């Protein structure tokens, strides 16, 4: 596991979303269910808790973009990148940005958005890519096909808790 | 060495400890035995000091258990997961949970009990998992040869001092 420069990470425990905009892809639940669910695979392991905003600045601004889109990294069009996330920090860092050249979808018949989430969430709270094959955060989205089958690799529980730590109320083996 | 976020630890010097339940796989006398070697290896680093309850509630309760159990984190069967324990604090905190689902031994020829239990009393009185290699508090601690060679790396001296200081004498 790797972490960014400095190892940024968030003071509060407690941390915002939002959800800015909407992809033609998936309907309005399929998006918001995606994204608590990428954010619940990194609560279970450390003190962390999201509430969501629906107005205002949120820690993290998720948003869907196509090419040039406001800031300092423009989107690749069909396939390549599928998204990208900023290190903690005010403003634009936590952010997390999805490619909508894309076909988002709730299964594995595009590019599923829970599993790019939970990946980008991930950098949004301040694990960097892997050198571990088989983590979520290991730069390399593929050929999966069980979401029934889901669980955070070792790497990515010792790099999240090197952070933040495990959660209060669990026990450590 | 690492320790749990927030750094939480225990307010006071004198803990209390209870053995709740027992294990089939061994005689009473050997769990007991297991148990306090186990308080005794980090007794002897710091001005920690131990006593025993039959009754009532103890800062860290020792119990044996399968699958769901009293709390939200149920065991797996044989091997993997071979024990649990929580951080310092009230109730369920502190406490150390055993897999009965393992062969808890007084030997090398099962999951050793004492070895076991030393890495999760380190759990009750603040030490999360360490990157040393040779330390007690390594997830794969279970290697060390617990009886003849066994010795407190220096880094668990240096975590659990960092908390609770060393030995006043
Ligand atoms: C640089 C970064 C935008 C790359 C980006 C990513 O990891 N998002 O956090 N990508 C990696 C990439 C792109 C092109 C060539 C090789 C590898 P991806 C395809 O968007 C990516 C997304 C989800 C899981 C794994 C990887
Ligand atoms: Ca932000
Ligand atoms: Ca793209
Ligand atoms: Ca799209
Ligand atoms: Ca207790
Ligand atoms: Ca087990
Ligand atoms: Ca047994
Ligand atoms: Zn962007
Ligand atoms: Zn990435
Ligand atoms: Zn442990
Ligand atoms: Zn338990």
Redesign the interface.
Known sequence: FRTFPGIPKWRKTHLTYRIVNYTPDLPKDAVDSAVEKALKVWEEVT?LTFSRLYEGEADIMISFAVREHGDFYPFDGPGNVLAHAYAPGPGINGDAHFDDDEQWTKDTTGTNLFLVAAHEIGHSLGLFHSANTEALMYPLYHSLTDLTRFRLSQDDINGI??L???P??????
């Open positions: 003190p808790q090197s933040y730590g495990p209060p109320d669990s026990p450590e083996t």
